[PDB]
Design an enzyme around this catalytic site. Structure first.
Site, PDB file in Angstrom:
ATOM      1  N   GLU A 124       0.827  -1.171   0.000  1.00  0.00           N
ATOM      2  CA  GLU A 124       0.000   0.000   0.000  1.00  0.00           C
ATOM      3  C   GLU A 124       0.891   1.261   0.000  1.00  0.00           C
ATOM      4  O   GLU A 124       0.450   2.330  -0.502  1.00  0.00           O
ATOM      5  CB  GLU A 124      -0.861   0.008   1.274  1.00  0.00           C
ATOM      6  CG  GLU A 124      -1.879   1.186   1.453  1.00  0.00           C
ATOM      7  CD  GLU A 124      -1.321   2.484   2.103  1.00  0.00           C
ATOM      8  OE1 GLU A 124      -0.157   2.535   2.627  1.00  0.00           O
ATOM      9  OE2 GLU A 124      -2.073   3.478   2.039  1.00  0.00           O
ATOM     10  N   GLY A 127      -5.467   7.654  -1.294  1.00  0.00           N
ATOM     11  CA  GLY A 127      -4.530   7.613  -0.185  1.00  0.00           C
ATOM     12  C   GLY A 127      -4.607   6.368   0.653  1.00  0.00           C
ATOM     13  O   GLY A 127      -3.795   6.178   1.564  1.00  0.00           O
ATOM     14  N   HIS A 178       5.335   7.960   9.249  1.00  0.00           N
ATOM     15  CA  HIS A 178       6.341   7.469   8.259  1.00  0.00           C
ATOM     16  C   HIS A 178       7.796   7.659   8.622  1.00  0.00           C
ATOM     17  O   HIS A 178       8.669   7.736   7.732  1.00  0.00           O
ATOM     18  CB  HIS A 178       6.123   8.076   6.864  1.00  0.00           C
ATOM     19  CG  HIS A 178       4.921   7.522   6.175  1.00  0.00           C
ATOM     20  ND1 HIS A 178       4.597   7.821   4.873  1.00  0.00           N
ATOM     21  CD2 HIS A 178       3.966   6.664   6.617  1.00  0.00           C
ATOM     22  CE1 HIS A 178       3.493   7.177   4.549  1.00  0.00           C
ATOM     23  NE2 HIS A 178       3.088   6.478   5.592  1.00  0.00           N
ATOM     24  N   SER A 227     -26.226  26.238 -17.743  1.00  0.00           N
ATOM     25  CA  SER A 227     -27.363  25.953 -16.920  1.00  0.00           C
ATOM     26  C   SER A 227     -27.166  24.716 -16.069  1.00  0.00           C
ATOM     27  O   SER A 227     -26.767  23.686 -16.577  1.00  0.00           O
ATOM     28  CB  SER A 227     -28.585  25.768 -17.793  1.00  0.00           C
ATOM     29  OG  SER A 227     -29.650  25.401 -16.960  1.00  0.00           O
ATOM     30  N   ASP A 268     -30.368  -6.032  -3.952  1.00  0.00           N
ATOM     31  CA  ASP A 268     -29.570  -5.802  -5.168  1.00  0.00           C
ATOM     32  C   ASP A 268     -29.731  -4.339  -5.580  1.00  0.00           C
ATOM     33  O   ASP A 268     -28.738  -3.717  -5.949  1.00  0.00           O
ATOM     34  CB  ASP A 268     -29.992  -6.714  -6.308  1.00  0.00           C
ATOM     35  CG  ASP A 268     -29.395  -8.111  -6.194  1.00  0.00           C
ATOM     36  OD1 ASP A 268     -28.731  -8.448  -5.175  1.00  0.00           O
ATOM     37  OD2 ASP A 268     -29.594  -8.895  -7.145  1.00  0.00           O
ATOM     38  N   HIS A 281     -16.178   7.229 -10.600  1.00  0.00           N
ATOM     39  CA  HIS A 281     -17.327   7.630  -9.801  1.00  0.00           C
ATOM     40  C   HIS A 281     -17.647   9.114 -10.112  1.00  0.00           C
ATOM     41  O   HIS A 281     -16.824  10.015 -10.008  1.00  0.00           O
ATOM     42  CB  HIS A 281     -17.007   7.426  -8.327  1.00  0.00           C
ATOM     43  CG  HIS A 281     -18.208   7.354  -7.439  1.00  0.00           C
ATOM     44  ND1 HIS A 281     -19.096   8.405  -7.281  1.00  0.00           N
ATOM     45  CD2 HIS A 281     -18.666   6.354  -6.657  1.00  0.00           C
ATOM     46  CE1 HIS A 281     -20.031   8.060  -6.415  1.00  0.00           C
ATOM     47  NE2 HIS A 281     -19.792   6.820  -6.024  1.00  0.00           N
TER      48      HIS A 281
HETATM   49  C1  LIG Z   1      -1.107   5.922  -1.801  1.00  0.00           C
HETATM   50  C2  LIG Z   1      -0.522   6.544  -0.718  1.00  0.00           C
HETATM   51  C3  LIG Z   1       0.370   5.734   0.206  1.00  0.00           C
HETATM   52  C4  LIG Z   1       0.460   6.323   1.621  1.00  0.00           C
HETATM   53  N1  LIG Z   1      -0.832   6.443   2.249  1.00  0.00           N
HETATM   54  C5  LIG Z   1      -0.887   6.842   3.501  1.00  0.00           C
HETATM   55  O1  LIG Z   1       0.133   7.056   4.184  1.00  0.00           O
HETATM   56  N2  LIG Z   1      -2.112   6.981   3.973  1.00  0.00           N
HETATM   57  C6  LIG Z   1      -2.368   7.505   5.311  1.00  0.00           C
HETATM   58  C7  LIG Z   1      -2.349   9.052   5.143  1.00  0.00           C
HETATM   59  C8  LIG Z   1      -2.117   9.852   6.441  1.00  0.00           C
HETATM   60  C9  LIG Z   1      -2.210  11.423   6.310  1.00  0.00           C
HETATM   61  C10 LIG Z   1      -3.517  11.967   5.674  1.00  0.00           C
HETATM   62  N3  LIG Z   1      -4.737  11.411   6.322  1.00  0.00           N
HETATM   63  C11 LIG Z   1      -5.879  11.228   5.637  1.00  0.00           C
HETATM   64  O2  LIG Z   1      -5.931  11.459   4.431  1.00  0.00           O
HETATM   65  C12 LIG Z   1      -7.102  10.549   6.346  1.00  0.00           C
HETATM   66  C13 LIG Z   1      -8.318  10.264   5.655  1.00  0.00           C
HETATM   67  C14 LIG Z   1      -9.427   9.628   6.311  1.00  0.00           C
HETATM   68  C15 LIG Z   1      -9.400   9.256   7.677  1.00  0.00           C
HETATM   69  I1  LIG Z   1     -11.034   8.240   8.809  1.00  0.00           I
HETATM   70  C16 LIG Z   1      -8.169   9.570   8.311  1.00  0.00           C
HETATM   71  C17 LIG Z   1      -7.049  10.185   7.695  1.00  0.00           C
HETATM   72  C18 LIG Z   1      -3.756   6.993   5.778  1.00  0.00           C
HETATM   73  O3  LIG Z   1      -4.727   6.998   4.962  1.00  0.00           O
HETATM   74  O4  LIG Z   1      -3.787   6.505   6.917  1.00  0.00           O
HETATM   75  C19 LIG Z   1       0.982   7.788   1.614  1.00  0.00           C
HETATM   76  O5  LIG Z   1       0.150   8.692   1.879  1.00  0.00           O
HETATM   77  O6  LIG Z   1       2.226   7.984   1.457  1.00  0.00           O
HETATM   78 ZN   LIG Z   2      -0.956   2.923   6.065  1.00  0.00          ZN
HETATM   79 ZN   LIG Z   3       1.468   4.995   5.284  1.00  0.00          ZN
END
Ligand SMILES: C=CC[C@H](NC(=O)N[C@@H](CCCCNC(=O)c1ccc(I)cc1)C(=O)O)C(=O)O
Ligand SMILES: [Zn+2]
Ligand SMILES: [Zn+2]
Ligand SMILES: *[C@@H]1O[C@H](CO)[C@@H](O[C@@H]2O[C@H](CO)[C@@H](O[C@@H]3O[C@H](CO)[C@@H](O)[C@H](O[C@H]4O[C@H](CO)[C@@H](O)[C@H](O)[C@@H]4O)[C@@H]3O)[C@H](O)[C@H]2NC(C)=O)[C@H](O)[C@H]1NC(C)=O
Ligand SMILES: *[C@@H]1O[C@H](CO)[C@@H](O[C@@H]2O[C@H](CO)[C@@H](O[C@@H]3O[C@H](CO)[C@@H](O)[C@H](O[C@H]4O[C@H](CO)[C@@H](O)[C@H](O)[C@@H]4O)[C@@H]3O)[C@H](O)[C@H]2NC(C)=O)[C@H](O)[C@H]1NC(C)=O
Ligand SMILES: C=CC[C@H](NC(=O)N[C@@H](CCCCNC(=O)c1ccc(I)cc1)C(=O)O)C(=O)O
Ligand SMILES: *[C@@H]1O[C@H](CO)[C@@H](O[C@@H]2O[C@H](CO)[C@@H](O)[C@H](O)[C@H]2NC(C)=O)[C@H](O)[C@H]1NC(C)=O
Ligand SMILES: *[C@@H]1O[C@H](CO)[C@@H](O[C@@H]2O[C@H](CO)[C@@H](O)[C@H](O)[C@H]2NC(C)=O)[C@H](O)[C@H]1NC(C)=O
Ligand SMILES: *[C@@H]1O[C@H](CO)[C@@H](O[C@@H]2O[C@H](CO)[C@@H](O)[C@H](O)[C@H]2NC(C)=O)[C@H](O)[C@H]1NC(C)=O
Ligand SMILES: *[C@@H]1O[C@H](CO)[C@@H](O[C@@H]2O[C@H](CO)[C@@H](O)[C@H](O)[C@H]2NC(C)=O)[C@H](O)[C@H]1NC(C)=O
Ligand SMILES: *[C@@H]1O[C@H](CO)[C@@H](O[C@@H]2O[C@H](CO)[C@@H](O)[C@H](O)[C@H]2NC(C)=O)[C@H](O)[C@H]1NC(C)=O
Ligand SMILES: *[C@@H]1O[C@H](CO)[C@@H](O[C@@H]2O[C@H](CO)[C@@H](O)[C@H](O)[C@H]2NC(C)=O)[C@H](O)[C@H]1NC(C)=O
Ligand SMILES: *[C@@H]1O[C@H](CO)[C@@H](O)[C@H](O)[C@H]1NC(C)=O
Ligand SMILES: *[C@@H]1O[C@H](CO)[C@@H](O)[C@H](O)[C@H]1NC(C)=O
Ligand SMILES: *[C@@H]1O[C@H](CO)[C@@H](O)[C@H](O)[C@H]1NC(C)=O
Ligand SMILES: *[C@@H]1O[C@H](CO)[C@@H](O)[C@H](O)[C@H]1NC(C)=O
Ligand SMILES: *[C@@H]1O[C@H](CO)[C@@H](O)[C@H](O)[C@H]1NC(C)=O
Ligand SMILES: *[C@@H]1O[C@H](CO)[C@@H](O)[C@H](O)[C@H]1NC(C)=O
Ligand SMILES: [Ca+2]
Ligand SMILES: [Ca+2]
Ligand SMILES: [Cl-]
Ligand SMILES: [Cl-]
Ligand SMILES: [Zn+2]
Ligand SMILES: [Zn+2]
EC number: 3.4.17.21
Lengths: 694, 694
Positions: A370, A464, A499, A574, A610, A633
């Site tokens: 991921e 993300g 990270h 419109s 469904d 979407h």
């Molecule tokens: C494809 C991305 C890989 C990786 N994904 C990742 O590191 N995801 C974390 C992001 C943490 C910071 C931003 N937080 C959010 O965007 C968020 C959205 C919904 C909720 I309920 C809580 C936080 C992640 O999604 O945990 C990255 O961002 O480098």
């Molecule tokens: Zn993660």
């Molecule tokens: Zn992460």
């Protein structure tokens, strides 16, 4: 009896703690042997817990690693060519951590190689609006410069892309204490703050929903055809490297050129935050040189997929999934979610051994890679898209359980709002000053909806995380929930240690959740949802909730268009059709809800379910969004300015964004109208899937 | 009782004859008032017959008409500019036909306007291989020439496109008596042959599955956004006009330049069939001038949609549809099919009034503007694609019932082969010398499979009729059946009077089927199929039949690739993956058939039926074929050389076609490999939809 309360009570804080500990003693970087070992351990424990089948699904995907014997680093170089300052080659590891050589140094995954030298320009957070402020108000040109940007606000891959489009030849990313140092708490290991030598890792892909950059549309299986690197989907074209604030202070302090335009451009370091280009007076001859030697390589990754077959509708799938791969120890991200997922599987397996089965099939996933751009979940979903399209009820994400300890945070489709509300009214608040009270009440008190009072905030899904392909490409109802901080302002920044090598078991256990009560709450929310989705006779989706938000979204996009009233007149722009569609949707959804209360007959039930299941699917446009064939979407997409944020009516919003600077206004507004028509037609079509079937 | 035999016996030859007569007394050209009147008549009679609901679905689509006061025609022009010969402005109308002014003169629908003058080049049937013979073996250059081509073999729109790609500035199409004059029969009105003044009308779109050229992907509804004419999807870019053989003899007889390369280039006219360019000696100064003044216009069209709601599975749809719009009187095409459809609705309505309902919902459609490129069916399917994707069981086409009186002709998906076989064993042969015998036996005797003996020939679906969007875009199982001629050789030419003013009620009644016994047979085949699809407890689809043909197709595409063994070695071109997928499909399909015999429980039944219904859907690639986003079926597509023919593994076949002339062989063979991977992955994915669901 075998009901939801039996399930909720089998979940124990102490088991989650045992699992978190077990999962975080060593690094589990995607593509490494340690990560494969953890996959085999998961698989074999999910069998013990009681699942019907547990299998590894492997793919060979493009991954990215530093070169072990030619490390990445940045220099200040003088006129004679001497490197007079060097950024560090690794983060000081946390106390008591033994196998050091195996900790991947900080790097930006997927950076190309390069040694650019140049003048620094500081671009703030490198958001679209920061680049507009630089080039359009301050008339400062980034072409041929190295940009230094602070992490925060927006996904790092958007920053790199903004810098590329502005002509930069390299990007330095760094963590400013304004964004990563909560006042009055200590640095790790004495507090949960980021120390000066800490550095946020992370991919800088230009995310476009594709998964493995070499095999868009198709799984990266054994006979896959791969694109060449040059045609690869979202790879940046300039070198990028991340640094901590000690190193950044050394780069920022010499900077000259123009003053920062205002104070929202200043972090907390003791430097002027000059925009540049270049250093001041005495050092105008010095340059910054990047040394990036990271390599892209096709590497095997492993998803663990556990199946708990349904007793009545085994051909309907509820998926609970999270990732297992981490940058280093994954104390919070992802093992605090993986530990919760393990405790949920254990608890479903217990009821299973006592003879119970869910009504619908449940799938549990431990996704790989991921961190390299949702590769494990996306390849699996490309492989199984036909099964998921016709059978997938819902997807529940389970990355990090906590990121603070203040209150609940939820993003999901409107179809799940009422489910989330009802479930949290039946759960205990674990918050101090709220004992005896429900999770709904504490959540509502601390995180109010900006629209309706007495309701909590639920956000839109973007990208993300691994729900993305299920929701944005396939149109399967999706949701996520975790515990969060009070700091609404930093909601896209990550917590301070995000990270970095300091995200450890001790971090969570000493500073986040000593009693594991927040993890237990989160397990109850995610398990509870999965339980209801999997066991309720009528799917727990309320289409009337979609009708309410469609109308907020329509009002909102209309409002953005009305900042241009003269063009709206001249080009006959419109929104009538879209309002009429949302009105029809409201009407049809409420007739549908009535029939849903007013109908024993298994076929009638399967038909109504469904209609509910396919309702999310009906918002999918098979042509995708413009230039984005995998964002399908029509109501939601990741924001083009911030992949972490969801944007509503993304087709219309992108056609409108910065429309005044389009050189051919007739063609730009023609494209807005086209998108209104697409959104109107899609809302009406979705609505008609809820009409009487014949 | 209320069973299939009751249904079959309610069908009467005499009713079909009454309907055919009623439907063909005046022209029903798409977009005209007469056609709208016939729609209102259908609608109101389908209500009388007993349908639950009957509605008009209207769209505003791009249509094409001649200019009433500036007629299209072709001249021979001399050096001084004098038009010394003119083609006719209308066909001599048939005997007893009154409202003449209302008969649309012959034209090629969608030709742009233009008056090009040039030298003639005769290109035979203007097939890809005729252009290869001209340019590559005879070294004759079409650029700047007018090409004259004979109708036949391939869809006329492929001819125009081949001529465009070769640089032609205009196209004259004509009907040669070799292809349209069966020896020893009289010209109409004394026989079923084409007279010298008769002319085949028809669109010359470059068909790409899009429907209305201005609104690809979306229905042409009231608020639709339309592309400009310049971006319009399949409009030809050079003028085109059709003529009869008297006029053609005048154009061909002066021709010089080179001799025809061989006798398969000669028709039956008394001319040398010289290839040109230009006329011989004395007339080398004369030129051919086209005058094309046709106009494109957005016009309203009307589909009639009748619903007969299912008693048990009202959310599953079996569709019987055919078109209503004709070029002129539509004696065969389409009213001989529409009359059969009317008799089927009448017969289902009868059982309905006695209290019976089908198990599944039946939809009856009278489509408009099929003659202008499948516009009515395609717009309706774009509007309802979400309902059809999740609910459509099958589509049965009903254009022309007869086109000869020799034997049955069937094209359908392999999923319906066993259904067709079983149904025709239970039907009487109406053929002389076969009384007492089954339709299966007469059909098998007269039209044997080239593969297995004791079986009749069933062909592949391409395009050219309204099933196309259901099958090629949406992946809904589709079928068609009609009575045909002995002449296998002319199977894509049309019968002699095809699309001319002479296709009348008298034509059918005096020469084709005086007793209406062939129409009755055809009604029984199409009604019978619709009955079984709609009423059988297990859907009557046999996935093992797909396994058998996939292996013929794989063998076939492999064979085409093996004419290039050296390139297969150098580029490692392997079909291993595709054979392995077809093997897995064979295995899984036969395990699936066993479970299908070996399972009362309504949910288990609905689950197995959903596996059957979705099996066709599983061959759909959401990315479509290369440059063909609306040809999504990976196993079948219309042939790029002949839209009337189906091609199997079309992605691989197109990557391989003429591969030796590709200038970059590495990139061409890389593209073959990519398509093998896509086909392999899709066969395996389809196969896995038939596995145990969990
Ligand atoms: C494809 C991305 C890989 C990786 N994904 C990742 O590191 N995801 C974390 C992001 C943490 C910071 C931003 N937080 C959010 O965007 C968020 C959205 C919904 C909720 I309920 C809580 C936080 C992640 O999604 O945990 C990255 O961002 O480098
Ligand atoms: Zn993660
Ligand atoms: Zn992460
Ligand atoms: C939301 O639901 C509503 C109502 O349930 C739905 O209404 C439909 O609106 C269209 C207009 O967009 C109606 O179209 C009309 O249909 C009649 C025949 O039934 C025609 O006579 C009309 O055509 C004339 O008028 C046009 C416009 O003035 C002219 O351009 C044209 O040349 C004709 O002279 C017209 O097409 C349609 O009848 C209703 N359907 C109903 C009432 O059931 C509305 O479309 C839905 N919203 C969306 C966005 O889908
Ligand atoms: C048709 O169905 C069959 C069988 O039911 C299915 O078989 C699958 O084939 C793949 C090979 O394409 C197998 O992949 C192997 O899996 C094992 C682990 O289970 C790995 O050890 C293997 O990897 C090694 O070998 C590779 C090739 O030599 C190396 O490149 C690699 O680096 C490794 O060292 C290998 O990936 C898979 O196990 C089976 N699945 C089974 C047996 O269930 C076949 O794929 C289907 N056909 C199609 C076209 O889908
Ligand atoms: C989109 C095309 C409009 C129109 N379509 C049309 O005129 N269709 C006729 C074609 C008749 C000649 C070729 N016949 C076949 O391709 C065929 C295929 C399957 C079977 I069973 C029988 C005949 C039509 O489909 O009837 C045209 O061709 O101009
Ligand atoms: C995490 O937990 C697992 C299982 O409880 C431990 O793996 C087991 O370890 C013992 C001793 O090596 C073996 O006998 C078993 O084969 C293992 N079980 C498995 C793989 O399912 C694992 O060692 C623990 N990890 C850490 C870091 O404590
Ligand atoms: C930063 O690192 C570089 C590279 O390791 C150092 O420069 C090298 O130093 C050695 C010894 O003086 C030379 O022989 C190399 O040729 C130099 N390499 C390059 C690329 O310049 C540099 O000294 C370090 N700077 C500081 C301040 O530590
Ligand atoms: C969440 O809870 C509410 C209130 O309990 C549920 O709404 C009730 O559902 C029952 C059963 O259909 C109705 O008869 C009541 O009239 C409903 N009350 C309302 C709408 O105020 C609601 O359905 C639940 N939502 C779910 C499970 O998705
Ligand atoms: C074709 O059949 C229909 C119905 O049998 C005829 O239309 C009817 O005609 C009579 C006399 O005009 C009217 O009283 C009815 O209103 C019509 N019924 C309808 C429209 O459903 C029609 O005229 C016949 N056409 C021809 C050419 O013979
Ligand atoms: C073919 O038709 C054209 C056009 O109607 C005829 O040419 C016209 O004839 C009249 C009377 O001689 C002239 O005044 C026009 O100017 C001519 N028009 C053009 C475009 O040439 C032509 O005579 C006809 N030829 C034959 C053989 O009938
Ligand atoms: C067509 O007819 C054949 C032969 O009658 C059907 O096959 C039989 O179906 C019954 C019911 O399942 C089986 O028990 C027999 O063993 C089958 N005989 C065979 C396969 O030779 C066949 O299923 C029919 N196909 C349809 C309706 O699609
Ligand atoms: C790492 O360092 C050097 C760079 O040339 C060399 O030994 C090796 O090729 C590199 N490793 C790679 C490219 O995997
Ligand atoms: C900015 O950067 C470079 C200077 O080398 C130049 O080529 C480019 O056109 C400039 N653009 C603007 C808007 O100044
Ligand atoms: C956990 O909550 C307590 C009480 O508010 C506080 O000391 C601490 O800041 C919280 N931990 C984190 C990581 O926010
Ligand atoms: C038909 O004939 C002439 C061509 O200029 C003119 O009267 C009219 O514009 C044409 N009709 C059209 C274009 O519909
Ligand atoms: C053929 O046609 C024209 C002659 O005007 C020329 O421009 C074109 O290049 C020629 N191509 C070939 C293959 O002869
Ligand atoms: C109908 O069949 C008879 C007997 O073979 C024959 O006279 C006639 O040619 C057939 N009609 C047509 C249109 O083929
Ligand atoms: Ca892929
Ligand atoms: Ca359209
Ligand atoms: Cl999450
Ligand atoms: Cl047909
Ligand atoms: Zn037709
Ligand atoms: Zn036709």
């Amino acid at each position: 009896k075998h009901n939801m309360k039996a399930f909720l009570d089998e979940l124990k804080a102490e088991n989650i703690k045992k699992f978190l500990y077990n999962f975080t003693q060593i690094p589990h970087l995607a593509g490494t042997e340690q990560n494969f070992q953890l996959a085999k351990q998961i698989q074999s424990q999910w069998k013990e817990f009681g699942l019907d089948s547990v299998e590894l699904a492997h793919y060979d995907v493009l991954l990215s690693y530093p070169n072990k014997t030619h490390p990445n680093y940045i220099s200040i170089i003088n006129e004679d060519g001497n490197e007079i300052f060097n950024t560090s080659l690794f983060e000081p590891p946390p106390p008591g951590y033994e196998n050091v050589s195996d900790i991947v140094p900080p790097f930006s995954a997927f950076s190309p190689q390069g040694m650019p030298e140049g003048d620094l320009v500081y671009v703030n957070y490198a958001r679209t609006e920061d680049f507009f402020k630089l080039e359009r108000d301050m008339k400062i040109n980034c072409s041929g410069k190295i940009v230094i940007a602070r992490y925060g606000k927006v996904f790092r891959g958007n920053k790199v892309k903004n810098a590329q489009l502005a002509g930069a030849k390299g990007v330095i990313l760094y963590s400013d204490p304004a964004d990563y140092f909560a006042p009055g708490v200590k640095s790790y290991p004495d507090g949960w703050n980021l120390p000066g030598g800490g550095v946020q890792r992370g991919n800088i892909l230009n995310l476009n929903g594709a998964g493995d950059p070499l095999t868009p549309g198709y799984p990266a299986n054994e006979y896959a055809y791969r694109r060449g690197i040059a045609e690869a989907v979202g790879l940046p074209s300039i070198p990028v490297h991340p640094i901590g604030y000690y190193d950044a202070q050394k780069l920022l302090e010499k900077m000259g050129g123009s003053a920062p335009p205002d104070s929202s451009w200043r972090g907390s370091l003791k430097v002027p935050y000059n925009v540049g280009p270049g250093f001041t007076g005495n050092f105008s001859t010095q340059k910054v040189k990047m040394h990036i030697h990271s390599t892209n390589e096709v590497t095997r990754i492993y998803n663990v997929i556990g199946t708990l077959r349904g007793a009545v509708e085994p051909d309907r799938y509820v998926i609970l999934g999270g990732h297992r791969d981490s940058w280093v120890f994954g104390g919070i991200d992802p093992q605090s979610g993986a530990a919760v997922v393990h405790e949920i599987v254990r608890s479903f397996g217990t009821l299973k051994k006592e003879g119970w089965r869910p009504r619908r099939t449940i799938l549990f996933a431990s996704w790989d890679a991921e961190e390299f751009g949702l590769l494990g979940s996306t390849e699996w979903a490309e492989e199984n898209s036909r099964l998921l399209q016709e059978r997938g009820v819902a997807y529940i994400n389970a990355d990090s359980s906590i990121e603070g300890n203040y209150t609940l945070r939820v993003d999901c489709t409107p179809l799940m709002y009422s489910l989330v509300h009802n479930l949290t009214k039946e759960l205990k608040s674990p918050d101090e000053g709220f004992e005896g009270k429900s999770l709904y009440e504490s959540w509502t008190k601390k995180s109010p909806s900006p629209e309706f009072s007495g309701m909590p905030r639920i956000s839109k899904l973007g990208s993300g995380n691994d729900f993305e392909v299920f929701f944005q490409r396939l149109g399967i109802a999706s949701g996520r929930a975790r515990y969060t901080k009070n700091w609404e302002t930093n909601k896209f920044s990550g917590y301070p240690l995000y990270h970095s090598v300091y995200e450890t078991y001790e971090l969570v256990e000493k500073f986040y959740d000593p009693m594991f009560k927040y993890h237990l709450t989160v397990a109850q929310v995610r398990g509870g949802m999965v339980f209801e989705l999997a066991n309720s006779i009528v799917l727990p989706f309320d289409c009337r909730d979609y009708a309410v938000v469609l109308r907020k979204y329509a009002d909102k996009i209309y409002s953005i268009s009305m900042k241009h009233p003269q063009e709206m007149k001249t080009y006959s722009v419109s929104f009538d059709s879209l309002f009429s569609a949302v009105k029809n949707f409201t009407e049809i959804a409420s007739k549908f809800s009535e029939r849903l209360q007013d109908f024993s007959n298994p076929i009638v039930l399967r038909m109504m379910n469904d209609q509910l299941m396919f309702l999310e699917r009906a918002f999918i446009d098979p042509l995708g969004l413009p230039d984005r064939p995998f964002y399908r979407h029509v109501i939601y997409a990741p924001s083009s300015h911030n992949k972490y944020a969801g944007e509503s009516f993304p087709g219309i919003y992108d056609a409108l964004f910065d429309i005044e600077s389009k050189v051919d206004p007739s063609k730009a507004w023609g494209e807005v109208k086209r998108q209104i028509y697409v959104a109107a037609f899609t809302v009406q079509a979705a609505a008609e899937t809820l009409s009487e079937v014949a």
